[PDB]
Amino acid sequence: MKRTWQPNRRKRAKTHGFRARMRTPGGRKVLKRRRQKGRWRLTPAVRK
Amino acid sequence: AVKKFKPYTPSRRFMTVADFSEITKTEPEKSLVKPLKKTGGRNNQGRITVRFRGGGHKRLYRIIDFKRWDKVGIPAKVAAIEYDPNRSARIALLHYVDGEKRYIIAPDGLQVGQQVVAGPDAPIQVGNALPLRFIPVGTVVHAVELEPKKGAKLARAAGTSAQIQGREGDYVILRLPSGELRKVHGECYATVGAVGNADHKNIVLGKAGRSRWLGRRPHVRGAAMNPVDHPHGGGEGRAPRGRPPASPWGWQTKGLKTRKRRKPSSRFIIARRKK
RNA sequence: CCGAGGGUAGGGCCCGUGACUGGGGCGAAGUCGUAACAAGGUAGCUGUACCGGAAGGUGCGGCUGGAU
RNA sequence: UGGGAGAGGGUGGUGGAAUUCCCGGAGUAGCGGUGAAAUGCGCAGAUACCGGGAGGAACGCCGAUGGCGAAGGCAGCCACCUGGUCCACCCGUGACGCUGAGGCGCGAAAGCGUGGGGAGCAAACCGGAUUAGAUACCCGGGUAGUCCACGCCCUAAACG
RNA sequence: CGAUGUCGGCUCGUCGCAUCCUGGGGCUGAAGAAGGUCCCAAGGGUUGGGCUGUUCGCCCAUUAAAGCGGCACGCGAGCUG
RNA sequence: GAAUGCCGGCAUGAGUAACGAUAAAGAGGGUGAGAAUCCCUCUCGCCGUAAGCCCAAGGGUUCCUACGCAAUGGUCGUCAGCGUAGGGUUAGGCGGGACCUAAGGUGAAGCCGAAAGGCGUAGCCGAAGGGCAGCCGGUUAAUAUUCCGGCCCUUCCCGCAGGUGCGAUGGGGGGACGCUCUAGGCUAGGGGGACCGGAGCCAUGGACGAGCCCGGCCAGAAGCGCAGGGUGGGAGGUAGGCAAAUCCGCCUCCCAACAAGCUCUGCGUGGUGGGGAAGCCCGGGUGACAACCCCCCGAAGCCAGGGAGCCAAGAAAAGCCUCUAAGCACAACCUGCGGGAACCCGUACCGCAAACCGACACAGGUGGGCGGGUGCAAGAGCACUCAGGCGCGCGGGAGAACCCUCGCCAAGGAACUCUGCAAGUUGGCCCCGUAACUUCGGGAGAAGGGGUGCUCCCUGGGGUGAUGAGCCCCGGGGAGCCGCAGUGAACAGGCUCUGGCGACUGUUUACCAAAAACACAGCUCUCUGCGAACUCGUAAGAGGAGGUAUAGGGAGCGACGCUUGCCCGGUGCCGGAAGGUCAAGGGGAGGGGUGCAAGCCCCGAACCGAAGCCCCGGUGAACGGCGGCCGUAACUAUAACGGUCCUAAGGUAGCGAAAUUCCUUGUCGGGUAAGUUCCGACCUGCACGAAAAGCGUAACGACCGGAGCGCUGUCUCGGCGAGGGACCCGGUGAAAUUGAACUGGCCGUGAAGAUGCGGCCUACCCGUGGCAGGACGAAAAGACCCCGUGGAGCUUUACUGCAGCC
RNA sequence: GAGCUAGCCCUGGCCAGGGUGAAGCUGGGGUGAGACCCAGUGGAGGCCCGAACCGGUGGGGGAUGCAAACCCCUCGGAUGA
Numbered sequence A: 001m002k003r004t005w006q007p008n009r010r011k012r013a014k015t016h017g018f019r020a021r022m023r024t025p026g027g028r029k030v031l032k033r034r035r036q037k038g039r040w041r042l043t044p045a046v047r048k
Numbered sequence B: 001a002v003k004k005f006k007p008y009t010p011s012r013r014f015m016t017v018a019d020f021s022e023i024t025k026t027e028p029e030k031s032l033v034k035p036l037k038k039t040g041g042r043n044n045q046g047r048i049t050v051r052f053r054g055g056g057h058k059r060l061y062r063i064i065d066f067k068r069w070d071k072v073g074i075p076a077k078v079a080a081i082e083y084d085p086n087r088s089a090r091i092a093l094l095h096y097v098d099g100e101k102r103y104i105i106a107p108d109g110l111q112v113g114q115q116v117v118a119g120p121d122a123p124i125q126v127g128n129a130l131p132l133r134f135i136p137v138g139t140v141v142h143a144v145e146l147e148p149k150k151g152a153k154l155a156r157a158a159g160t161s162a163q164i165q166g167r168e169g170d171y172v173i174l175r176l177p178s179g180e181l182r183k184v185h186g187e188c189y190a191t192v193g194a195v196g197n198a199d200h201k202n203i204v205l206g207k208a209g210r211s212r213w214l215g216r217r218p219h220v221r222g223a224a225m226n227p228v229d230h231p232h233g234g235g236e237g238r239a240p241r242g243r244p245p246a247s248p249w250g251w252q253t254k255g256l257k258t259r260k261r262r263k264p265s266s267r268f269i270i271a272r273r274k275k
Numbered sequence C: 001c002c003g004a005g006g007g008u009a010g011g012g013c014c015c016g017u018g019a020c021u022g023g024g025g026c027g028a029a030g031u032c033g034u035a036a037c038a039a040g041g042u043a044g045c046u047g048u049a050c051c052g053g054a055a056g057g058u059g060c061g062g063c064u065g066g067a068u
Numbered sequence D: 001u002g003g004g005a006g007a008g009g010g011u012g013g014u015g016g017a018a019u020u021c022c023c024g025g026a027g028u029a030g031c032g033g034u035g036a037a038a039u040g041c042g043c044a045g046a047u048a049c050c051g052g053g054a055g056g057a058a059c060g061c062c063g064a065u066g067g068c069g070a071a072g073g074c075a076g077c078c079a080c081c082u083g084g085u086c087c088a089c090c091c092g093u094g095a096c097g098c099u100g101a102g103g104c105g106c107g108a109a110a111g112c113g114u115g116g117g118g119a120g121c122a123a124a125c126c127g128g129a130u131u132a133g134a135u136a137c138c139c140g141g142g143u144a145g146u147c148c149a150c151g152c153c154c155u156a157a158a159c160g
Numbered sequence E: 001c002g003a004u005g006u007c008g009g010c011u012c013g014u015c016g017c018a019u020c021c022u023g024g025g026g027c028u029g030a031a032g033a034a035g036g037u038c039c040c041a042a043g044g045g046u047u048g049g050g051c052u053g054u055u056c057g058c059c060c061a062u063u064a065a066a067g068c069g070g071c072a073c074g075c076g077a078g079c080u081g
Numbered sequence F: 001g002a003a004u005g006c007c008g009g010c011a012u013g014a015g016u017a018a019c020g021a022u023a024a025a026g027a028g029g030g031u032g033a034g035a036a037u038c039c040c041u042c043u044c045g046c047c048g049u050a051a052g053c054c055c056a057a058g059g060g061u062u063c064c065u066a067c068g069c070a071a072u073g074g075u076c077g078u079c080a081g082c083g084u085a086g087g088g089u090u091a092g093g094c095g096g097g098a099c100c101u102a103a104g105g106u107g108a109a110g111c112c113g114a115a116a117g118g119c120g121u122a123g124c125c126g127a128a129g130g131g132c133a134g135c136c137g138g139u140u141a142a143u144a145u146u147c148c149g150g151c152c153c154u155u156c157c158c159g160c161a162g163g164u165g166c167g168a169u170g171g172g173g174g175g176a177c178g179c180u181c182u183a184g185g186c187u188a189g190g191g192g193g194a195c196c197g198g199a200g201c202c203a204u205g206g207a208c209g210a211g212c213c214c215g216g217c218c219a220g221a222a223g224c225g226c227a228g229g230g231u232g233g234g235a236g237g238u239a240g241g242c243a244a245a246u247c248c249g250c251c252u253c254c255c256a257a258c259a260a261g262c263u264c265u266g267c268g269u270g271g272u273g274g275g276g277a278a279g280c281c282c283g284g285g286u287g288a289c290a291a292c293c294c295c296c297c298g299a300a301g302c303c304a305g306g307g308a309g310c311c312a313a314g315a316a317a318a319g320c321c322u323c324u325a326a327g328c329a330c331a332a333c334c335u336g337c338g339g340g341a342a343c344c345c346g347u348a349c350c351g352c353a354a355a356c357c358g359a360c361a362c363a364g365g366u367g368g369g370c371g372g373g374u375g376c377a378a379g380a381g382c383a384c385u386c387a388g389g390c391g392c393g394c395g396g397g398a399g400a401a402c403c404c405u406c407g408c409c410a411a412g413g414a415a416c417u418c419u420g421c422a423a424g425u426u427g428g429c430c431c432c433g434u435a436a437c438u439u440c441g442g443g444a445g446a447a448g449g450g451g452u453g454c455u456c457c458c459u460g461g462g463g464u465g466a467u468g469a470g471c472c473c474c475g476g477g478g479a480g481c482c483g484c485a486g487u488g489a490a491c492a493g494g495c496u497c498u499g500g501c502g503a504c505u506g507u508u509u510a511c512c513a514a515a516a517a518c519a520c521a522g523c524u525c526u527c528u529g530c531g532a533a534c535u536c537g538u539a540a541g542a543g544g545a546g547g548u549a550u551a552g553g554g555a556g557c558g559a560c561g562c563u564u565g566c567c568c569g570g571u572g573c574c575g576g577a578a579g580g581u582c583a584a585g586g587g588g589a590g591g592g593g594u595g596c597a598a599g600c601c602c603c604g605a606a607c608c609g610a611a612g613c614c615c616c617g618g619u620g621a622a623c624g625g626c627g628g629c630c631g632u633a634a635c636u637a638u639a640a641c642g643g644u645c646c647u648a649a650g651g652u653a654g655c656g657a658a659a660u661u662c663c664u665u666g667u668c669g670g671g672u673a674a675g676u677u678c679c680g681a682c683c684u685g686c687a688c689g690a691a692a693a694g695c696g697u698a699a700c701g702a703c704c705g706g707a708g709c710g711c712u713g714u715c716u717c718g719g720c721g722a723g724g725g726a727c728c729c730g731g732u733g734a735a736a737u738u739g740a741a742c743u744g745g746c747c748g749u750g751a752a753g754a755u756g757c758g759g760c761c762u763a764c765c766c767g768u769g770g771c772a773g774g775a776c777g778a779a780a781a782g783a784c785c786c787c788g789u790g791g792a793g794c795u796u797u798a799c800u801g802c803a804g805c806c
Numbered sequence G: 001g002a003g004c005u006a007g008c009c010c011u012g013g014c015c016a017g018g019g020u021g022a023a024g025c026u027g028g029g030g031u032g033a034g035a036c037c038c039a040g041u042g043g044a045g046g047c048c049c050g051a052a053c054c055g056g057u058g059g060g061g062g063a064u065g066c067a068a069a070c071c072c073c074u075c076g077g078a079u080g081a
């Protein structure tokens, strides 16, 4: 049956991407926190 | 006359349609239509604020001339009467000898090829617009402004009209469609006659599908819900209301007056509606 | 081939019968009230409508086959 | 051909009297109603009086034992559209007539459907009386309906 | 109660005997035939349908008879539901 | 040493279940250390509206070649979507960007908010919509509308010539639109040919044939032809299209008019360039100088912005055309031509799947286009089959029980069972015929029946041609032939009588309920006069609505028909300028603290003082409510009648053992041999009843009852047969569970149901196929029940706040 | 977090074939004119049968599954909410 993951590059970049995060107080806190933790990727990898 | 069908389906048994007889042109004037932004009953937050709306036929909006004092003295010829999806009244296309083209809502009895004009000096004939102070007491009238130069606000739906009842100072006294008796400023413009398409109320929708075509989504009773949803919710089996009948939001809905008492316009309302 | 008739199926008319039910006729020795015949104690009758234990009443319109 | 009388019919307009309601003034101890009363209304200012307004219905005098219509029925006034009928002239047609099973149309009131309208009145209903009782008659309220449009119903002491 | 699945049916039986039938008896208000009542006896047998989820029960048609109980009201790691 | 402890390691179950669709395999040859599994050939089977082909998502080298086989692959492996390495994706015209706007997003100006932030006409962003120039063939191991070949085309720059008042982010036109039905003419695609080209074939009884088999086209500027789309021309006036305007709009006059004309597209032809089968032969050569023609069928595609009808009335903006303003008029623009210039990103491969979503090479899910032929009335249905692709990554035997999916069955025919559950029956088409009832549509495919193949002969109308033959379509009549049987295979309603509920088509508990529940047209109450009420938001701002009482919100009821009674004392709502009560504030009689004092400070009575509540009315399709007892009629029985208690008032019409009835299988009637169900009645209705509507109602229903006809393995009552498992052999190899175990019966005992205690009985050791009575077998720290001064959802005239409103 | 799901907004796409035969229109009949009747034409509909597509009625299977909702048979809608 139809499952929950239906990948869509435009949806991914527009929803979780760097520019969506920076637009918003909570999103900048995500970036701050992932940088403080030393994450290798701050934002999901999506090909464009 | 509304049009009936033979009962060759269960729904065609009761369905009735407007006859569209007064209609003379089946295409809108291109320079006077603009796209009508459907809302689904949702506001600028995205939230539903009027329940059970959406999914109706696509529509273009026709720009209606609701001032008309805009062109005093300039007469126009009635070129066509057209269907308008955004209102119950039919609409009439006017060719001004100016060369300007405008729509008004079609009064009862308007004829294609007749002339109309607006102004303090206009003949008292169907389709003409004058300030209220220059219309004889007792003539029935429509598209009435509520305040000078703010635009026609009253008696715009199919078959409706207001009647001049008298004069007092700078103000005239009107019987609105609802039966209310109200003072309106004498400089307010009205159009002599009643609104057309008076058979509108005799239309039998006939089936659930027609409401859907009109953008009206199914309405669900409070009694059909649960207590988290509605005062009338819950109960084992069916249930009477078991409290004063109420809205989804808790206010009472069988008599509870809701007009704001300290309202400035109270000074100008003479007798509350009848019936 | 036609064919008495037999068989399968579906209709029409008629008769008898039926838990129960509707009013009708007659009986007479009963209970309730007294609607009509006198102006019959609210003049009568009347089509229709609504109503009342019951005769009946009232409304609307009609007739005189109504006493004074 | 030329004349007459008429609430004959249909559509639209429009006039004044009265009732009810609302507003302003003035005023106060009751009003109303009956055979007599009570319910009801009234000091939260009624009734009676004056001014203004809204609205529906019916048309006083003329009016008559009158007039018109085939019957049912038709009554303020105006205009338009239209029917029947009588009269005088004796001009035209030449029995072209009478009746009429079936058919078709019209058909008071009540009633029905869909809209409107709603003052007065008033089935049902509620209350007061009357009365042995009073699901009545009499009194105070009161909804259909009575009014307009369209469509039905097709009855009658539709009688001379 | 860190779980012992609960009515009825189906299937599969097995046991008790306070015996429904069949076998053996005493008494009888046992003439005969047919019954009544008690004693011995558990080897075998103990039907098919209508109604109702029913167990039970009523009814139809038969029968030598159409027994009553136990087995976690036998039996859901056997089925049904 | 225990915490259903934590981490790790290793056992048991066990050589057990399983190895992922029952579309299927066999053999020969080759390779190699090794072969059921890799390569090749022949034979066999399966898909073929796909299980074939193209495209978009998504994936991201999985593509191609070489060399490998530890692991991955459910076995094997020499193979592979796996390991290593090398190679491979080529664009002015295809898609996106250097163009346009949609919702939405953002947001100059502006508005709002403790901060963060929220909004916001213009502008900007935003596409799978608008707009815009490339077709055919060849080539590589691997890309191709990209490279090459042929023939075409677009924009930009510069120049030349001709023409013109040129000039715009401004004005206007246009772009520009629905649904259903549909004309003409074409094309895609298809079928036939006795005609054209072709390697060959004559089998096994016949055929050297009008035989068999194979093929018989594709692209193409200008021109031309055929069919369609779009568009009137001239002048005079002009006050409107936020400046101007010669444009557009409006008025008038003249010519034109279903025409032509101009214009634009489609199709045909067209210089020219391409392709080209079977078979034979080792993807390649030959066939071949291949031929490339006639007839028929024919789109849902094209002409297209075509036509008609209908109501629910069907985007924007740019490109484009036109108009003019500043400007500028040696410029600028337009037309033709010539030379030059033309950037960025994608392009491999998979793509209904072993490469995407599902932890898996997972029987599931995934949008668009092409999707041949014949027969069955049609068709994308069904059977077979073309092109093309596959046999589903464990096999070999055997021929038990049992299981699954399937076939048949004597006689009976629902006796099965909660129930005909399931499975039979019926089954397409043509013809005949068809009831109650009905809202006149229907019910209706009612029911029930007849026909159905093939051959000969005669014959009627249509399409295309030409009016004819040929081809194709729809028929009609007569005579015959064969079988058990002619929709001969496959796909294809069992039917009727009668109740309940809901009018109806629809909607729903994703994953235990599809219903009588929700919705629904329709009915009523009620609120709202517009900066509406109402809703969301602290606000600004939005929805409502660019609507205006024939409108919008809230509530109940639920097509339609006939109806919808009585009670306003309580609660709610509505009306009530009197009165009662009423907070802050006003008021300030009187009293008090302190000071030598003027003074400062505190208390404080009357009186004035809102909404609300009290009070007076109204109001039921507002919340709701709608009795009891005693007595009375020529026999009994009952009570039309009277009396009395209570109440705000005592249930009306209709219906009633009901989706409601406890007693209950009420009583009676019907149906049956027999009827706790069913239908019809009765009424002492435990405990119907009128918009939480009452009583009906044609039609409708995968709803729930009851009956009958047909037919059946449902059953009496079972039997046989088929295939996939189960079983045996080779390969690979789990799982929950498990204190340890050397783990029998009875009668007892024991925390009351013992393999484990007592007594007795029985019993050599160890497996395999089977069955489920026990191990209070497994699973899940019982969802019932209680307890905890545990939790959460929900209610209200519980308490106490808050928003909102007054 | 609305790449599942629910609703709405914008923009596109899809629905083989067959059946029934509403209004209207034309002709005829009728009438004083009409109503209306008959035939032909016509092609309406939350119309009918049935694929794709969308569902999920009854039964069977599956139940450490092919699958944390699947499979076979059967069944509902299929121009419309």
Ligand SMILES: NCCCC[C@H](N)C(=O)N[C@H](CO)[C@H](O)c1ccc([N+](=O)[O-])cc1
Binding pocket: E003, E004, E005, E006
């Ligand atoms: N899946 C586990 C079994 C539990 C379900 C079972 N019905 C049950 O309640 N079992 C419990 C024993 O754990 C017990 O036997 C029981 C069974 C039945 C009842 N009862 O009232 O019918 C009560 C108690």
Ligand SMILES: [K+]
Binding pocket: E001, E003
């Ligand atoms: K327990």
Ligand SMILES: [Mg+2]
Binding pocket: A005
């Ligand atoms: Mg997942």
Ligand SMILES: [Mg+2]
Binding pocket: A007
């Ligand atoms: Mg992904």
Ligand SMILES: [Mg+2]
Binding pocket: A008, A009, A010, A011
């Ligand atoms: Mg994307």
Ligand SMILES: [Mg+2]
Binding pocket: A010
């Ligand atoms: Mg995308």
Ligand SMILES: [Mg+2]
Binding pocket: A008, A010, A011
């Ligand atoms: Mg997206």
Ligand SMILES: [Mg+2]
Binding pocket: A013, A014, A015, A016, A017, A018, A019, A020, A021
């Ligand atoms: Mg982003």
Ligand SMILES: [Mg+2]
Binding pocket: A040
């Ligand atoms: Mg790094």
Ligand SMILES: [Mg+2]
Binding pocket: A040
């Ligand atoms: Mg990481």
Ligand SMILES: [Mg+2]
Binding pocket: A016, A021, A030, A031, A034, A042, A043, A044
């Ligand atoms: Mg992040």
Ligand SMILES: [Mg+2]
Binding pocket: B001, B019, B021, B022
């Ligand atoms: Mg009209």
Ligand SMILES: [Mg+2]
Binding pocket: B003, B004, B005, B006, B012, B013, B014, B015, B016
């Ligand atoms: Mg109708």
Ligand SMILES: [Mg+2]
Binding pocket: B004, B005, B006, G022, G023
């Ligand atoms: Mg019709």
Ligand SMILES: [Mg+2]
Binding pocket: B004, B005, B006
């Ligand atoms: Mg009609």
Ligand SMILES: [Mg+2]
Binding pocket: B007, B008, B009, B010, F441, F442
């Ligand atoms: Mg119908």
